[PDB]
Amino acid sequence: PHLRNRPGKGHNYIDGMTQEDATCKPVTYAGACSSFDVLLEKGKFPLFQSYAHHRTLLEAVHDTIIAKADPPSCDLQSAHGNPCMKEKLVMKTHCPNDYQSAHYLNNDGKMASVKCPPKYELTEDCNFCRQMTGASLKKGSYPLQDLFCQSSEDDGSKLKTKMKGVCEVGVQALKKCDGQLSTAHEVVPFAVFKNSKKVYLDKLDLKTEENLLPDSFVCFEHKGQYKGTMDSGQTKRELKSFDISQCPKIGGHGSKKCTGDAAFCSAYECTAQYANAYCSHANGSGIVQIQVSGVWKKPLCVGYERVVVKRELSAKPIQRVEPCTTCITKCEPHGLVVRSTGFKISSAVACASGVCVTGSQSPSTEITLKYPGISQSSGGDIGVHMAHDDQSVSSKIVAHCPPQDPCLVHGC
Amino acid sequence: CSELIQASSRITEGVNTKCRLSGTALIRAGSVGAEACLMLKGVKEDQTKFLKIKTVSSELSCREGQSYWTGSFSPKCLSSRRCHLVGECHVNRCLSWRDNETSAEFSFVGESTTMRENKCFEQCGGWGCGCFNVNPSCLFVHTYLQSVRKEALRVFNCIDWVHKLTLEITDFDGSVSTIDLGASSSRFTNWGSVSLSLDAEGISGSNSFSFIESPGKGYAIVDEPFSEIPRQGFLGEIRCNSESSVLSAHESCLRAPNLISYKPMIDQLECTTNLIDPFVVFERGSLPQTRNDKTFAASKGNRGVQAFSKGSVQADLTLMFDNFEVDFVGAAVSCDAAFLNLTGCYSCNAGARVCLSITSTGTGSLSAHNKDGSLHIVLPSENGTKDQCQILHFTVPEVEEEFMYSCDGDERPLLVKGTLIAIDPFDDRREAGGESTVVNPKSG
Ligand SMILES: *[C@@H]1O[C@H](CO)[C@@H](O[C@@H]2O[C@H](CO)[C@@H](O[C@@H]3O[C@H](CO)[C@@H](O)[C@H](O)[C@H]3NC(C)=O)[C@H](O)[C@H]2NC(C)=O)[C@H](O)[C@H]1NC(C)=O
Ligand SMILES: *[C@@H]1O[C@H](CO)[C@@H](O)[C@H](O)[C@H]1NC(C)=O
Ligand SMILES: *[C@@H]1O[C@H](CO)[C@@H](O)[C@H](O)[C@H]1NC(C)=O
């Protein structure tokens, strides 16, 4: 249970729901917090479970990393007639039972939550409040989105949503479109930067780089340990969290003797006397950087949603119209010759009342062909199909010819 | 041109008493543009209903075998670099990464039907690379293909070519009937059925090419054999079974191994590939094309491909149970005719074109017959002066004959003049023959 050694204060509680301060004020190996234990269930919240040693939304809020929205959480008991549930109703979520509250990161990059009236619980889609008699509601709030938060100083005031072929994602109106509008629920990764709003992304590529800052170390201490806090006889072997702000930095001063692994000893001053706490290195921590518009940036925090996107499938798939007539067709006693413009003709076929005749030649602006059947003697109309080198030129043309005299053709 | 005396019925003044003529008829099918002729004679100056089966055209259609679809695809990649011992960056996990298996970092993708693969690459391990550990780190890449253009191409092959005859059936009192049928096949038309023998050749070999069909745009030919297994660097490297699968890059589409080129250079990953644009190849070999004297081209109606090869066939279509008669035709009609000209050749497949000026007071037909009965001329007669044409066969350089023409009335003398051109074969042994020639190229 090393994941319960939270970075920073580890305050996994929300304002108003302060009935679980025994175990939700700093989250430790001992208790059980309703607003945190859901994150560690197998198969749920996999993105945070991968980045398990980064702050949650509530933790980031309590460290002043992420601000709190204006109507911080308009209670449905007192504000069910106000335009509150606008960003919530565009998301597709799934809450478990016996939960009276649920918090999410709104569009402006702040934290807002939905609180059902007392003794009511949130339904399976977190959209309605339902009252079940004789039910014990949990004391925490369900994290709606799957996200992990960190502290950043990189500025992102010029960052904006840039998705191709999207007219509207979530509650953001990307542009104005007319015509067909494909509408569906999609999993859209997002990120929030300093002095910015939510920035939905098309591709989620990110990297982490480790460091030796205090948030990268997991200090603990045994319960009942000699010459330590809570130094009394015990009946169970359990750990206890330790604050790294006490162990002295290298070449510095501190209040508690501290020991640890190689990474801790390389940055802090590992003691030579009896140690008070063991400070290892959070094996997954570091600084996570996102790539937006090719350039890497440091987000306040990233996640993903299930919002409704209004795409545009197509304006026009393809247009195939070509009534081209840039050719001259003049029947000649020597042969059927058609003179065309710049586009060259390699092979052609001539059809006149069933019987057809074909010709092949190198690409040229003109081609001569033998007359099909008795069309030379009888004249009439003759259709010609040819293969142009270019495109957008009609391949079916018709030539009108009067009756001809074979004597000139065979004259010798 | 042939009678039906074996099963002739009594086609009461005016009223019709047709007995559903059951006797079949056997007449050799005429050449291309010619017609097949019938004699429903009743009482002189009455009846004489003519059934005409005009030979529209003969084409060497294609019998398609296997087929598949393809389009233009472009890849997109998602990367996630984690240090050693983080997640599943164990050397064994990084090396054994099964493309079919997805990493836990790109779980927002979740379940999807897009064609996709997953790769894992090692990078530097050490404080210079970015990780305190010295064992190599990992870079998980998820790549999925997406379609660029909203179009697809169908690629098929012709296992064999079949002779196919198009006939214009000029039924009794109305010529609205066109039928297309192959060799040794029957078509259940009105008044029974029509069957074609075409005993000469039911096939014209095979080939080793493949044809592209763009829906609503035309056809094309590629100079490669049709391969049922995808191959890198050829057409159909990525192939599907439907246009929807192509336009959505569905995972059911097959593709060759090692199509995506990965450049894991330390700053940014580069996911790219070199793929043959099927649209370029389609535009390159547009249909109107000639290969070793075959000249494949789009069939009339744009529903397939043809094969213009030198040859000819013998066709003997058989009518059966032909019965289409009414009672209003019992009245006689007057008609007049005037000879116009004579053009064409002799002893030739094309024949000699015969045109006649018809001046009639109403609906009717023409039954000009020569003295010996060898040559028959039939032309419909309509109100006012009309100019209709017919096609006959001759074996004389000059034509000078008289025909007993009568449009359901009295026979009057119709005289035809003119000479016929000579089809220089610059190569003759004893004769030419009519047969039924399928279209052929110049290089034959
Ligand atoms: C032998 O006489 C035939 C019968 O007149 C001619 O064959 C065709 O005659 C048609 C009408 O009798 C003509 O149709 C005309 O076509 C022109 C232009 O193509 C248009 O004005 C109309 O479609 C039509 N005009 C009408 C109905 O008044 C054909 O022009 C004609 N075919 C041709 C081109 O020969 C022959 O002309 C004639 N043979 C010889 C050797 O001259
Ligand atoms: C390393 O961290 C991952 C989560 O980031 C954890 O699953 C794994 O157990 C850790 N390795 C250890 C503790 O050896
Ligand atoms: C694909 O992966 C799944 C789970 O990762 C596995 O059950 C299945 O056997 C794999 N199929 C292969 C390797 O062909």
PDB file of N, CA and C in Angstrom, chain A residues 228-309:
ATOM      1  N   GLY A 228      11.068   7.211  17.822  1.00  0.00           N
ATOM      2  CA  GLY A 228      10.304   7.822  16.757  1.00  0.00           C
ATOM      3  C   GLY A 228       8.941   8.255  17.257  1.00  0.00           C
ATOM      4  N   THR A 229       8.211   8.946  16.384  1.00  0.00           N
ATOM      5  CA  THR A 229       6.847   9.336  16.715  1.00  0.00           C
ATOM      6  C   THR A 229       5.983   8.096  16.892  1.00  0.00           C
ATOM      7  N   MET A 230       5.070   8.156  17.862  1.00  0.00           N
ATOM      8  CA  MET A 230       4.265   7.007  18.274  1.00  0.00           C
ATOM      9  C   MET A 230       5.182   5.856  18.703  1.00  0.00           C
ATOM     10  N   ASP A 231       5.901   6.100  19.798  1.00  0.00           N
ATOM     11  CA  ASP A 231       6.856   5.141  20.348  1.00  0.00           C
ATOM     12  C   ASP A 231       6.189   4.427  21.521  1.00  0.00           C
ATOM     13  N   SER A 232       5.369   3.433  21.191  1.00  0.00           N
ATOM     14  CA  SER A 232       4.670   2.651  22.199  1.00  0.00           C
ATOM     15  C   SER A 232       4.450   1.246  21.662  1.00  0.00           C
ATOM     16  N   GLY A 233       4.193   0.317  22.580  1.00  0.00           N
ATOM     17  CA  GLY A 233       4.006  -1.067  22.181  1.00  0.00           C
ATOM     18  C   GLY A 233       2.846  -1.213  21.214  1.00  0.00           C
ATOM     19  N   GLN A 234       3.002  -2.124  20.259  1.00  0.00           N
ATOM     20  CA  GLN A 234       2.030  -2.318  19.198  1.00  0.00           C
ATOM     21  C   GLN A 234       1.627  -3.783  19.126  1.00  0.00           C
ATOM     22  N   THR A 235       0.467  -4.022  18.518  1.00  0.00           N
ATOM     23  CA  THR A 235      -0.018  -5.368  18.256  1.00  0.00           C
ATOM     24  C   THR A 235      -0.032  -5.703  16.772  1.00  0.00           C
ATOM     25  N   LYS A 236       0.343  -4.761  15.912  1.00  0.00           N
ATOM     26  CA  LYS A 236       0.362  -4.974  14.474  1.00  0.00           C
ATOM     27  C   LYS A 236       1.564  -4.256  13.880  1.00  0.00           C
ATOM     28  N   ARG A 237       2.067  -4.791  12.772  1.00  0.00           N
ATOM     29  CA  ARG A 237       3.212  -4.215  12.071  1.00  0.00           C
ATOM     30  C   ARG A 237       2.683  -3.366  10.922  1.00  0.00           C
ATOM     31  N   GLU A 238       2.644  -2.052  11.134  1.00  0.00           N
ATOM     32  CA  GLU A 238       2.143  -1.110  10.146  1.00  0.00           C
ATOM     33  C   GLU A 238       3.103   0.064  10.026  1.00  0.00           C
ATOM     34  N   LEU A 239       3.104   0.687   8.851  1.00  0.00           N
ATOM     35  CA  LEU A 239       3.969   1.821   8.583  1.00  0.00           C
ATOM     36  C   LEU A 239       3.271   3.122   8.972  1.00  0.00           C
ATOM     37  N   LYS A 240       3.987   4.231   8.824  1.00  0.00           N
ATOM     38  CA  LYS A 240       3.453   5.547   9.135  1.00  0.00           C
ATOM     39  C   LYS A 240       4.183   6.570   8.279  1.00  0.00           C
ATOM     40  N   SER A 241       3.434   7.520   7.731  1.00  0.00           N
ATOM     41  CA  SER A 241       4.014   8.484   6.810  1.00  0.00           C
ATOM     42  C   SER A 241       4.963   9.427   7.537  1.00  0.00           C
ATOM     43  N   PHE A 242       5.917   9.970   6.786  1.00  0.00           N
ATOM     44  CA  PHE A 242       6.936  10.859   7.323  1.00  0.00           C
ATOM     45  C   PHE A 242       7.094  12.054   6.397  1.00  0.00           C
ATOM     46  N   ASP A 243       7.329  13.224   6.983  1.00  0.00           N
ATOM     47  CA  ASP A 243       7.457  14.461   6.220  1.00  0.00           C
ATOM     48  C   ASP A 243       8.926  14.704   5.899  1.00  0.00           C
ATOM     49  N   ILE A 244       9.249  14.759   4.603  1.00  0.00           N
ATOM     50  CA  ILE A 244      10.635  14.914   4.173  1.00  0.00           C
ATOM     51  C   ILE A 244      11.188  16.303   4.437  1.00  0.00           C
ATOM     52  N   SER A 245      10.350  17.250   4.852  1.00  0.00           N
ATOM     53  CA  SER A 245      10.833  18.594   5.139  1.00  0.00           C
ATOM     54  C   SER A 245      11.750  18.641   6.351  1.00  0.00           C
ATOM     55  N   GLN A 246      11.825  17.561   7.128  1.00  0.00           N
ATOM     56  CA  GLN A 246      12.640  17.528   8.336  1.00  0.00           C
ATOM     57  C   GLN A 246      14.042  16.989   8.087  1.00  0.00           C
ATOM     58  N   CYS A 247      14.183  16.000   7.211  1.00  0.00           N
ATOM     59  CA  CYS A 247      15.497  15.425   6.944  1.00  0.00           C
ATOM     60  C   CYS A 247      16.395  16.468   6.288  1.00  0.00           C
ATOM     61  N   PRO A 248      17.611  16.668   6.786  1.00  0.00           N
ATOM     62  CA  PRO A 248      18.445  17.763   6.278  1.00  0.00           C
ATOM     63  C   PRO A 248      18.886  17.531   4.842  1.00  0.00           C
ATOM     64  N   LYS A 249      18.991  18.626   4.096  1.00  0.00           N
ATOM     65  CA  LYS A 249      19.562  18.572   2.763  1.00  0.00           C
ATOM     66  C   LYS A 249      21.078  18.454   2.854  1.00  0.00           C
ATOM     67  N   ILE A 250      21.692  18.004   1.757  1.00  0.00           N
ATOM     68  CA  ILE A 250      23.131  17.777   1.759  1.00  0.00           C
ATOM     69  C   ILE A 250      23.852  19.091   2.022  1.00  0.00           C
ATOM     70  N   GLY A 251      24.835  19.049   2.919  1.00  0.00           N
ATOM     71  CA  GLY A 251      25.505  20.263   3.347  1.00  0.00           C
ATOM     72  C   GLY A 251      24.590  21.261   4.019  1.00  0.00           C
ATOM     73  N   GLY A 252      23.599  20.786   4.772  1.00  0.00           N
ATOM     74  CA  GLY A 252      22.637  21.671   5.396  1.00  0.00           C
ATOM     75  C   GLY A 252      22.273  21.278   6.813  1.00  0.00           C
ATOM     76  N   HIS A 253      21.104  21.715   7.272  1.00  0.00           N
ATOM     77  CA  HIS A 253      20.652  21.472   8.632  1.00  0.00           C
ATOM     78  C   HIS A 253      19.226  20.940   8.618  1.00  0.00           C
ATOM     79  N   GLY A 254      18.925  20.074   9.582  1.00  0.00           N
ATOM     80  CA  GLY A 254      17.608  19.488   9.708  1.00  0.00           C
ATOM     81  C   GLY A 254      17.312  19.163  11.157  1.00  0.00           C
ATOM     82  N   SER A 255      16.145  18.557  11.380  1.00  0.00           N
ATOM     83  CA  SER A 255      15.700  18.226  12.724  1.00  0.00           C
ATOM     84  C   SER A 255      15.670  16.734  13.019  1.00  0.00           C
ATOM     85  N   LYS A 256      15.601  15.883  11.999  1.00  0.00           N
ATOM     86  CA  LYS A 256      15.517  14.443  12.187  1.00  0.00           C
ATOM     87  C   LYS A 256      16.602  13.749  11.381  1.00  0.00           C
ATOM     88  N   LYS A 257      17.179  12.701  11.958  1.00  0.00           N
ATOM     89  CA  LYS A 257      18.103  11.858  11.217  1.00  0.00           C
ATOM     90  C   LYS A 257      17.336  11.053  10.176  1.00  0.00           C
ATOM     91  N   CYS A 258      17.909  10.938   8.983  1.00  0.00           N
ATOM     92  CA  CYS A 258      17.196  10.361   7.854  1.00  0.00           C
ATOM     93  C   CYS A 258      18.128   9.481   7.037  1.00  0.00           C
ATOM     94  N   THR A 259      17.611   8.342   6.586  1.00  0.00           N
ATOM     95  CA  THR A 259      18.347   7.428   5.725  1.00  0.00           C
ATOM     96  C   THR A 259      17.453   7.009   4.566  1.00  0.00           C
ATOM     97  N   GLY A 260      18.072   6.481   3.522  1.00  0.00           N
ATOM     98  CA  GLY A 260      17.316   6.098   2.352  1.00  0.00           C
ATOM     99  C   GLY A 260      18.152   5.335   1.353  1.00  0.00           C
ATOM    100  N   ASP A 261      17.641   5.268   0.127  1.00  0.00           N
ATOM    101  CA  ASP A 261      18.295   4.534  -0.946  1.00  0.00           C
ATOM    102  C   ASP A 261      19.360   5.412  -1.603  1.00  0.00           C
ATOM    103  N   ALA A 262      19.879   4.958  -2.747  1.00  0.00           N
ATOM    104  CA  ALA A 262      20.954   5.681  -3.419  1.00  0.00           C
ATOM    105  C   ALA A 262      20.496   7.053  -3.896  1.00  0.00           C
ATOM    106  N   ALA A 263      19.293   7.134  -4.471  1.00  0.00           N
ATOM    107  CA  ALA A 263      18.800   8.413  -4.973  1.00  0.00           C
ATOM    108  C   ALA A 263      18.631   9.423  -3.846  1.00  0.00           C
ATOM    109  N   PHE A 264      18.097   8.984  -2.705  1.00  0.00           N
ATOM    110  CA  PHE A 264      17.954   9.881  -1.565  1.00  0.00           C
ATOM    111  C   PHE A 264      19.313  10.327  -1.038  1.00  0.00           C
ATOM    112  N   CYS A 265      20.265   9.399  -0.931  1.00  0.00           N
ATOM    113  CA  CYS A 265      21.590   9.745  -0.436  1.00  0.00           C
ATOM    114  C   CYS A 265      22.344  10.662  -1.387  1.00  0.00           C
ATOM    115  N   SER A 266      22.025  10.630  -2.681  1.00  0.00           N
ATOM    116  CA  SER A 266      22.697  11.498  -3.637  1.00  0.00           C
ATOM    117  C   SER A 266      22.251  12.949  -3.536  1.00  0.00           C
ATOM    118  N   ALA A 267      21.069  13.207  -2.984  1.00  0.00           N
ATOM    119  CA  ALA A 267      20.534  14.558  -2.859  1.00  0.00           C
ATOM    120  C   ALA A 267      20.441  15.043  -1.424  1.00  0.00           C
ATOM    121  N   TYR A 268      19.992  14.197  -0.507  1.00  0.00           N
ATOM    122  CA  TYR A 268      19.919  14.539   0.904  1.00  0.00           C
ATOM    123  C   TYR A 268      21.113  13.958   1.649  1.00  0.00           C
ATOM    124  N   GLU A 269      21.258  14.372   2.903  1.00  0.00           N
ATOM    125  CA  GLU A 269      22.375  13.948   3.743  1.00  0.00           C
ATOM    126  C   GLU A 269      21.946  12.714   4.524  1.00  0.00           C
ATOM    127  N   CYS A 270      22.386  11.543   4.069  1.00  0.00           N
ATOM    128  CA  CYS A 270      22.080  10.307   4.775  1.00  0.00           C
ATOM    129  C   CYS A 270      22.919  10.215   6.044  1.00  0.00           C
ATOM    130  N   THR A 271      22.269   9.891   7.155  1.00  0.00           N
ATOM    131  CA  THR A 271      22.921   9.931   8.453  1.00  0.00           C
ATOM    132  C   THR A 271      23.826   8.720   8.655  1.00  0.00           C
ATOM    133  N   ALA A 272      24.704   8.835   9.653  1.00  0.00           N
ATOM    134  CA  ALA A 272      25.545   7.731  10.088  1.00  0.00           C
ATOM    135  C   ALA A 272      25.142   7.176  11.445  1.00  0.00           C
ATOM    136  N   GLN A 273      24.240   7.845  12.156  1.00  0.00           N
ATOM    137  CA  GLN A 273      23.738   7.367  13.433  1.00  0.00           C
ATOM    138  C   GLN A 273      22.473   6.544  13.203  1.00  0.00           C
ATOM    139  N   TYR A 274      21.752   6.253  14.280  1.00  0.00           N
ATOM    140  CA  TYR A 274      20.474   5.563  14.170  1.00  0.00           C
ATOM    141  C   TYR A 274      19.460   6.480  13.494  1.00  0.00           C
ATOM    142  N   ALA A 275      18.858   6.004  12.409  1.00  0.00           N
ATOM    143  CA  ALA A 275      17.976   6.836  11.608  1.00  0.00           C
ATOM    144  C   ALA A 275      16.570   6.872  12.195  1.00  0.00           C
ATOM    145  N   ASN A 276      15.835   7.927  11.846  1.00  0.00           N
ATOM    146  CA  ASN A 276      14.460   8.098  12.296  1.00  0.00           C
ATOM    147  C   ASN A 276      13.428   7.728  11.241  1.00  0.00           C
ATOM    148  N   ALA A 277      13.791   7.760   9.963  1.00  0.00           N
ATOM    149  CA  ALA A 277      12.855   7.411   8.906  1.00  0.00           C
ATOM    150  C   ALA A 277      13.630   6.968   7.677  1.00  0.00           C
ATOM    151  N   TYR A 278      12.999   6.117   6.876  1.00  0.00           N
ATOM    152  CA  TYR A 278      13.579   5.609   5.641  1.00  0.00           C
ATOM    153  C   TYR A 278      12.898   6.299   4.469  1.00  0.00           C
ATOM    154  N   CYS A 279      13.682   7.000   3.654  1.00  0.00           N
ATOM    155  CA  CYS A 279      13.165   7.793   2.543  1.00  0.00           C
ATOM    156  C   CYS A 279      13.615   7.164   1.230  1.00  0.00           C
ATOM    157  N   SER A 280      12.705   6.456   0.574  1.00  0.00           N
ATOM    158  CA  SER A 280      12.987   5.865  -0.723  1.00  0.00           C
ATOM    159  C   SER A 280      12.623   6.862  -1.822  1.00  0.00           C
ATOM    160  N   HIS A 281      12.633   6.404  -3.069  1.00  0.00           N
ATOM    161  CA  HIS A 281      12.363   7.246  -4.227  1.00  0.00           C
ATOM    162  C   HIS A 281      11.103   6.740  -4.909  1.00  0.00           C
ATOM    163  N   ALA A 282      10.109   7.619  -5.056  1.00  0.00           N
ATOM    164  CA  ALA A 282       8.882   7.262  -5.757  1.00  0.00           C
ATOM    165  C   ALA A 282       9.231   6.818  -7.169  1.00  0.00           C
ATOM    166  N   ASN A 283       9.048   5.528  -7.456  1.00  0.00           N
ATOM    167  CA  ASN A 283       9.678   4.950  -8.638  1.00  0.00           C
ATOM    168  C   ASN A 283       9.059   5.465  -9.929  1.00  0.00           C
ATOM    169  N   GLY A 284       7.829   5.966  -9.878  1.00  0.00           N
ATOM    170  CA  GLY A 284       7.165   6.472 -11.056  1.00  0.00           C
ATOM    171  C   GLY A 284       7.080   7.974 -11.187  1.00  0.00           C
ATOM    172  N   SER A 285       7.573   8.729 -10.210  1.00  0.00           N
ATOM    173  CA  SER A 285       7.362  10.167 -10.190  1.00  0.00           C
ATOM    174  C   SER A 285       8.274  10.867 -11.194  1.00  0.00           C
ATOM    175  N   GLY A 286       8.221  12.192 -11.189  1.00  0.00           N
ATOM    176  CA  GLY A 286       8.995  13.026 -12.079  1.00  0.00           C
ATOM    177  C   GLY A 286       8.197  14.247 -12.469  1.00  0.00           C
ATOM    178  N   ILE A 287       8.524  14.804 -13.632  1.00  0.00           N
ATOM    179  CA  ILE A 287       7.785  15.919 -14.213  1.00  0.00           C
ATOM    180  C   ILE A 287       7.281  15.470 -15.575  1.00  0.00           C
ATOM    181  N   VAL A 288       5.972  15.559 -15.779  1.00  0.00           N
ATOM    182  CA  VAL A 288       5.333  15.098 -17.004  1.00  0.00           C
ATOM    183  C   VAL A 288       5.147  16.289 -17.928  1.00  0.00           C
ATOM    184  N   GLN A 289       5.574  16.139 -19.177  1.00  0.00           N
ATOM    185  CA  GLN A 289       5.481  17.193 -20.174  1.00  0.00           C
ATOM    186  C   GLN A 289       4.627  16.719 -21.340  1.00  0.00           C
ATOM    187  N   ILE A 290       3.769  17.608 -21.824  1.00  0.00           N
ATOM    188  CA  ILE A 290       2.873  17.308 -22.925  1.00  0.00           C
ATOM    189  C   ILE A 290       3.397  17.996 -24.176  1.00  0.00           C
ATOM    190  N   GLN A 291       3.033  17.453 -25.334  1.00  0.00           N
ATOM    191  CA  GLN A 291       3.451  17.982 -26.628  1.00  0.00           C
ATOM    192  C   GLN A 291       2.230  18.554 -27.334  1.00  0.00           C
ATOM    193  N   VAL A 292       2.180  19.876 -27.452  1.00  0.00           N
ATOM    194  CA  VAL A 292       1.100  20.575 -28.133  1.00  0.00           C
ATOM    195  C   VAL A 292       1.702  21.390 -29.267  1.00  0.00           C
ATOM    196  N   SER A 293       1.187  21.186 -30.481  1.00  0.00           N
ATOM    197  CA  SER A 293       1.688  21.862 -31.679  1.00  0.00           C
ATOM    198  C   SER A 293       3.182  21.614 -31.873  1.00  0.00           C
ATOM    199  N   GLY A 294       3.618  20.388 -31.596  1.00  0.00           N
ATOM    200  CA  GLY A 294       5.000  20.009 -31.816  1.00  0.00           C
ATOM    201  C   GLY A 294       5.950  20.367 -30.692  1.00  0.00           C
ATOM    202  N   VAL A 295       5.666  21.445 -29.971  1.00  0.00           N
ATOM    203  CA  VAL A 295       6.538  21.908 -28.898  1.00  0.00           C
ATOM    204  C   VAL A 295       6.051  21.340 -27.572  1.00  0.00           C
ATOM    205  N   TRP A 296       6.987  20.826 -26.778  1.00  0.00           N
ATOM    206  CA  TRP A 296       6.648  20.296 -25.467  1.00  0.00           C
ATOM    207  C   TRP A 296       6.270  21.417 -24.509  1.00  0.00           C
ATOM    208  N   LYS A 297       5.336  21.114 -23.611  1.00  0.00           N
ATOM    209  CA  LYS A 297       4.902  22.053 -22.590  1.00  0.00           C
ATOM    210  C   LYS A 297       4.685  21.302 -21.285  1.00  0.00           C
ATOM    211  N   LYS A 298       4.621  22.059 -20.191  1.00  0.00           N
ATOM    212  CA  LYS A 298       4.387  21.487 -18.871  1.00  0.00           C
ATOM    213  C   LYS A 298       2.959  21.788 -18.445  1.00  0.00           C
ATOM    214  N   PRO A 299       2.054  20.816 -18.495  1.00  0.00           N
ATOM    215  CA  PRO A 299       0.657  21.084 -18.160  1.00  0.00           C
ATOM    216  C   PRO A 299       0.436  21.176 -16.663  1.00  0.00           C
ATOM    217  N   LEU A 300      -0.601  21.926 -16.286  1.00  0.00           N
ATOM    218  CA  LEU A 300      -1.059  21.873 -14.905  1.00  0.00           C
ATOM    219  C   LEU A 300      -1.546  20.474 -14.568  1.00  0.00           C
ATOM    220  N   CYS A 301      -2.382  19.896 -15.434  1.00  0.00           N
ATOM    221  CA  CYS A 301      -2.654  18.464 -15.401  1.00  0.00           C
ATOM    222  C   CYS A 301      -3.502  18.026 -16.582  1.00  0.00           C
ATOM    223  N   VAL A 302      -3.401  16.731 -16.885  1.00  0.00           N
ATOM    224  CA  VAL A 302      -3.962  16.122 -18.080  1.00  0.00           C
ATOM    225  C   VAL A 302      -4.927  15.012 -17.679  1.00  0.00           C
ATOM    226  N   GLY A 303      -5.807  14.672 -18.608  1.00  0.00           N
ATOM    227  CA  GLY A 303      -6.733  13.582 -18.401  1.00  0.00           C
ATOM    228  C   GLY A 303      -7.477  13.269 -19.677  1.00  0.00           C
ATOM    229  N   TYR A 304      -8.641  12.642 -19.525  1.00  0.00           N
ATOM    230  CA  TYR A 304      -9.517  12.412 -20.664  1.00  0.00           C
ATOM    231  C   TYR A 304     -10.958  12.332 -20.183  1.00  0.00           C
ATOM    232  N   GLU A 305     -11.876  12.566 -21.112  1.00  0.00           N
ATOM    233  CA  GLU A 305     -13.300  12.655 -20.832  1.00  0.00           C
ATOM    234  C   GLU A 305     -14.057  11.758 -21.797  1.00  0.00           C
ATOM    235  N   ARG A 306     -15.383  11.780 -21.687  1.00  0.00           N
ATOM    236  CA  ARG A 306     -16.282  11.203 -22.684  1.00  0.00           C
ATOM    237  C   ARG A 306     -17.316  12.281 -22.983  1.00  0.00           C
ATOM    238  N   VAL A 307     -16.989  13.163 -23.919  1.00  0.00           N
ATOM    239  CA  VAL A 307     -17.837  14.292 -24.251  1.00  0.00           C
ATOM    240  C   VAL A 307     -18.450  14.056 -25.626  1.00  0.00           C
ATOM    241  N   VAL A 308     -19.384  14.925 -25.991  1.00  0.00           N
ATOM    242  CA  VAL A 308     -20.091  14.834 -27.262  1.00  0.00           C
ATOM    243  C   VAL A 308     -19.414  15.771 -28.254  1.00  0.00           C
ATOM    244  N   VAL A 309     -18.892  15.205 -29.337  1.00  0.00           N
ATOM    245  CA  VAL A 309     -18.218  15.963 -30.382  1.00  0.00           C
ATOM    246  C   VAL A 309     -19.116  16.011 -31.608  1.00  0.00           C
TER     247      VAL A 309
END
